[PDB]
Amino acid sequence: NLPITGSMDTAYANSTQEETFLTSTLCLYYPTEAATEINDNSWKDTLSQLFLTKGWPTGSVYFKEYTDIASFSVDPQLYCDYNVVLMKYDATLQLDMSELADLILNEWLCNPMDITLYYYQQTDEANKWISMGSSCTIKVCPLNTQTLGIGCLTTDTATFEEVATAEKLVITDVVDGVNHKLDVTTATCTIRNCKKLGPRENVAVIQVGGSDVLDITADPTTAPQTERMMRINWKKWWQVFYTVVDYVNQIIQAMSKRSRSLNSAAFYYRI
Amino acid sequence: NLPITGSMDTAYANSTQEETFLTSTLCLYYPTEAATEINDNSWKDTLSQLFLTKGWPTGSVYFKEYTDIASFSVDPQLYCDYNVVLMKYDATLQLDMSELADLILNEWLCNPMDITLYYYQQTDEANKWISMGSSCTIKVCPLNTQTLGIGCLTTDTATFEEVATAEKLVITDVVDGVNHKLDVTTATCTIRNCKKLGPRENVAVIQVGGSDVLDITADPTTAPQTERMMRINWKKWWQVFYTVVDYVNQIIQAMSKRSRSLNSAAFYYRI
Amino acid sequence: QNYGINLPITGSMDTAYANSTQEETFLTSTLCLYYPTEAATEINDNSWKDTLSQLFLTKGWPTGSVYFKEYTDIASFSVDPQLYCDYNVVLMKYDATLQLDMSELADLILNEWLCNPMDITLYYYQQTDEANKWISMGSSCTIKVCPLNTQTLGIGCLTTDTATFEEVATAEKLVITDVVDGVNHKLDVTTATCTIRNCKKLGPRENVAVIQVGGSDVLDITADPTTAPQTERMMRINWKKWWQVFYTVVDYVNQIIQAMSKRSRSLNSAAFYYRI
Amino acid sequence: QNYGINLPITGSMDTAYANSTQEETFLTSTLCLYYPTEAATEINDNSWKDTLSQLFLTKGWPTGSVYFKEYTDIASFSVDPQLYCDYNVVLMKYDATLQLDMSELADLILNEWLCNPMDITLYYYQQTDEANKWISMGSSCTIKVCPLNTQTLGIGCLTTDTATFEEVATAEKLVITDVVDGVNHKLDVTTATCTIRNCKKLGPRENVAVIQVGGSDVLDITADPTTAPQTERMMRINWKKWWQVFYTVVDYVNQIIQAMSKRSRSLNSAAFYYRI
Numbered sequence A, B: 001n002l003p004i005t006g007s008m009d010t011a012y013a014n015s016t017q018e019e020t021f022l023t024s025t026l027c028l029y030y031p032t033e034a035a036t037e038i039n040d041n042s043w044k045d046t047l048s049q050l051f052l053t054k055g056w057p058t059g060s061v062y063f064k065e066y067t068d069i070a071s072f073s074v075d076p077q078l079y080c081d082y083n084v085v086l087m088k089y090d091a092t093l094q095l096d097m098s099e100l101a102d103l104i105l106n107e108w109l110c111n112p113m114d115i116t117l118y119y120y121q122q123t124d125e126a127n128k129w130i131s132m133g134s135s136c137t138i139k140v141c142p143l144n145t146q147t148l149g150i151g152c153l154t155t156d157t158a159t160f161e162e163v164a165t166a167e168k169l170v171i172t173d174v175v176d177g178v179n180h181k182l183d184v185t186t187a188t189c190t191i192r193n194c195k196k197l198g199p200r201e202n203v204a205v206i207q208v209g210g211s212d213v214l215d216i217t218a219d220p221t222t223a224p225q226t227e228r229m230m231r232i233n234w235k236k237w238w239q240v241f242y243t244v245v246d247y248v249n250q251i252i253q254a255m256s257k258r259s260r261s262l263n264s265a266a267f268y269y270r271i
Numbered sequence C, D: 001q002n003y004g005i006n007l008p009i010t011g012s013m014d015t016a017y018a019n020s021t022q023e024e025t026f027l028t029s030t031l032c033l034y035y036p037t038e039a040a041t042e043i044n045d046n047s048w049k050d051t052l053s054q055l056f057l058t059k060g061w062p063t064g065s066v067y068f069k070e071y072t073d074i075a076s077f078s079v080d081p082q083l084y085c086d087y088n089v090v091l092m093k094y095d096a097t098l099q100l101d102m103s104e105l106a107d108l109i110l111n112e113w114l115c116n117p118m119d120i121t122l123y124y125y126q127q128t129d130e131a132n133k134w135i136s137m138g139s140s141c142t143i144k145v146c147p148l149n150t151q152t153l154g155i156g157c158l159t160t161d162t163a164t165f166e167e168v169a170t171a172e173k174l175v176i177t178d179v180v181d182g183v184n185h186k187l188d189v190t191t192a193t194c195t196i197r198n199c200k201k202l203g204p205r206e207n208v209a210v211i212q213v214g215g216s217d218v219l220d221i222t223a224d225p226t227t228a229p230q231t232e233r234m235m236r237i238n239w240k241k242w243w244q245v246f247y248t249v250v251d252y253v254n255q256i257i258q259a260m261s262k263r264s265r266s267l268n269s270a271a272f273y274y275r276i
């Protein structure tokens, strides 16, 4: 990172939309019920040809399927340069979907949390505990300077306070500056101490149906809808995919290249 | 592609090896027999830890396994920024080793061929026909200027001249300027008309045991033996992997980034 | 010398060349020929060494300067090879199945080494630099290594269970183990059957020339995968009979020793310098 | 850096004296004690080596720097001794019946020897100068010699008949033969149980000291009758208990090392002269 000096009289360059469409890849994540309703084995080819009409080279649009929001929330691996997640809306899962967005619309720096030997705390409002697995049931016992527990006994987990049960993904936020003993099913869950660095610009979430319920910020005073959080009413999935294809330029305009240099181990679908 | 003007007094920068390892990744391709002899369920983990001692961050080194040279030759996909292929030497598979090395050490620009409709010819010395699949059998019938076979009958394919039998990968080089009718088992193998653009500088091949027998150029008058074609003597595979880990600095020094802009969206690892 | 080793030597680029010292070199030097037992078997003669001495005399050597050290095979000769003469010419026989052993022997005798004892039963060992290796030789040498970590715990192997260690050498007369540098390794070796030393490669030998009889260029005297230097002291010939090989060696001894340099023979005959 | 050349070194007669290097020498060097088995039996303590190491530590030697090597007796030790430490001290018990054997042992280890092979079958051998000797080692060395004349016929001997050869060694573990220089000799040696080498005495071996435990001064490391030099590395002590001997060795180790110098042939400056 170096200072960048620019002249306000500089001329705008031509549109780079065609070049980025040519040199980038698009990943679409949709629920399995979409494929079920569409009921066509060649719909991937059809959408690829339509995207080609929109400018994307054949083979650069990758279609990925997930069973549901809860299943997809277990270590979501976003591959392409541009990722669009068609997330079905369920009034009962408002938190979970929000968490999923909170997981994929932001960059997270995470380190392992070996709870069974160590005591942990959250240093600042950017710190959270992200737990992912088949079943994440997390109980918390706040502690104090004398190392005793408040309304909890370290020797009896039954007295721990319940913050998660049977979760595929959950973001736990506790009071900062306080040590907590943790009890999570390590067999079916992995908990990580994470810091949200900032927005993840290459991931857009399109909520299919419902209303604006997403809250990607733990602060109760903010519920910001960024340009990467779209929301479309629906009755047929074919119309949903047609509107995704037709307004692909608008969707990618709302997104930007990831720009982060990572330390992780994930594959990517790039050109 | 613009001219670059440089001064012969510009100060050398510091070593980029540390940041290169922290920002790049290493795919190591080994045969199945290597894992069989190692006889450990966690040799990947210890090799990754040793690589970390050598500088690479955890999860950056990828370990891919192939049954043998023939099977690996069937459309090999190279994922990491730096690819090292440990190829065992067999005195009876020199041409197959050479063809694999040619395919993965050079950059190729390929287009499909329709052998059942049109006749084909090779324009210049860089033009070849690469056929790969489960079983490639290619027979050729050179035609004269009256589109009539020479020493072959266009109607009868039994008179055709056999250039490949049951191969999994074969690079066919015929006389340039002559139209050839091709009889290829398209049901089990695909043939593509390709041009050699240049070297793939991100792929190194380490020949385990044997002699210098590789020939990555069809010209009889050249056997280059470039700096990306190493050879070692061995008795045990653990020694081979320890040598690869210890001298990974030299291996990566012998390689450079791919530098080619691709029109194809494939699966890669990139940190 | 020592007190003037770090002193410059200045030469003028017009100093007249001295005459040939080849004749005076042969009259004050000793030549050692190392050949396999099968060479003597195929020759099938008892006075052949005397005839070779007389032929070398025809080539300018005094009687008493050429010596012939027979060795059974490469593997046995690889156990503490001893270099006796001013000039050593080792006739190695090529076998496709013993490429690594040939390379290890050439590495041992074509280079200077500085070795120290390794009491592998008490301490763990590292390899500090790319010039550091572990050279082990004996009747039979099986080496098992367990890399440790910063906490001194084995990686991929239990520090207490040798069965989990990693095999890098099985029943070796000679083996040069190269491990990842900077990592502590617990070792277990058949100490009864072989000795293992921590060795450092100082540089070439310059008085040992290895002639490979038959085969292709397969020797690799450097552990670095991206280098296979073919120095002027590692020669290769094609053969159908051993008398022709010996006649070639005698007739081109001028060329063979022009490719070697005197002053490199150590007081000891060992292929390595040793410090305890 | 300039290894093959002897460059003069100039020094001013008034520069300074650097500080004592004894402490650093003891910290970065290794000491080896060679003693007879009967010493160990008389001491009759299992942990005595540990006690001696502790006592040396009191004198500034880091633990593990001092080594103790056992040898059965003078004759057995004389068979190809291998002194590998930086500093070597050999406690040699005096036997009035083994005066020449002790002299030969000391001459072998207190001097520097450059040895070439000898093939008694092929060649007849001369000794060129006063520094040329024939050193033979083995389980049993029996050397008989027939001096020839200018016509290659024996003098007081027949080359074909070894029974007439003049015996100069019988069942020796080590023997240094000195014969008349400039005379070709035919040698009969028990090659099965003995190897003979044509050796040149280059000079003193600085880093080897011999402490004679017992009788008067009898060692003669010089083949010349007119001189029997007693160098500062040839110590002599009167004894009644081996514990007393070892305590004397430990207490005066400063003086013992002061009487010795780093082996000139074993440090980098010796590179491309003979060894390292």
Ligand SMILES: *[C@@H]1O[C@H](CO)[C@@H](O)[C@H](O)[C@H]1NC(C)=O
Residues within 6 Å of the ligand: A014
């Ligand atoms: C930009 O668009 C204009 C308008 O057609 C065209 O003339 C020009 O070549 C394009 N490229 C650049 C680099 O300005």
Ligand SMILES: *[C@@H]1O[C@H](CO)[C@@H](O)[C@H](O)[C@H]1NC(C)=O
Residues within 6 Å of the ligand: B014
């Ligand atoms: C480069 O290395 C030098 C010396 O190793 C050091 O002073 C300097 O800070 C390093 N970084 C840069 C950017 O020059």
Ligand SMILES: *[C@@H]1O[C@H](CO)[C@@H](O)[C@H](O)[C@H]1NC(C)=O
Residues within 6 Å of the ligand: C019
């Ligand atoms: C060197 O060779 C030349 C010509 O063969 C001869 O005249 C001369 O005496 C020789 N010796 C020396 C010391 O130059």
Ligand SMILES: *[C@@H]1O[C@H](CO)[C@@H](O)[C@H](O)[C@H]1NC(C)=O
Residues within 6 Å of the ligand: D019
């Ligand atoms: C040498 O000895 C003197 C006097 O004891 C001391 O002051 C000095 O630090 C020592 N070291 C050097 C390098 O002179």
Ligand SMILES: [Ca+2]
Residues within 6 Å of the ligand: A095, A096, A099, A167, A168, A169, A170
């Ligand atoms: Ca949840």
Ligand SMILES: [Ca+2]
Residues within 6 Å of the ligand: A151, A152, A158, A159, A160, A161
């Ligand atoms: Ca409670």
Ligand SMILES: [Ca+2]
Residues within 6 Å of the ligand: A122, A124, A125, A127, A173, A174, A175, A176
């Ligand atoms: Ca908090």
Ligand SMILES: [Ca+2]
Residues within 6 Å of the ligand: A215, A216, A217, A218, A219, A220, A221, A222, A223
């Ligand atoms: Ca909020």
Ligand SMILES: [Ca+2]
Residues within 6 Å of the ligand: B095, B096, B099, B167, B168, B169, B170
């Ligand atoms: Ca093939």
Ligand SMILES: [Ca+2]
Residues within 6 Å of the ligand: B151, B152, B153, B159, B160, B161
């Ligand atoms: Ca035909």
Ligand SMILES: [Ca+2]
Residues within 6 Å of the ligand: B122, B124, B125, B127, B173, B174, B175, B176
């Ligand atoms: Ca062609």
Ligand SMILES: [Ca+2]
Residues within 6 Å of the ligand: B215, B216, B217, B218, B219, B220, B221, B222, B223
């Ligand atoms: Ca070629």
Ligand SMILES: [Ca+2]
Residues within 6 Å of the ligand: C100, C101, C104, C172, C173, C174, C175
């Ligand atoms: Ca070997």
Ligand SMILES: [Ca+2]
Residues within 6 Å of the ligand: B040, C156, C157, C164, C165, C166
């Ligand atoms: Ca293991």
Ligand SMILES: [Ca+2]
Residues within 6 Å of the ligand: B246, C127, C129, C130, C132, C178, C179, C180, C181
């Ligand atoms: Ca190493």
Ligand SMILES: [Ca+2]
Residues within 6 Å of the ligand: B231, B232, C220, C221, C222, C223, C224, C225, C226, C227, C228
């Ligand atoms: Ca090499």
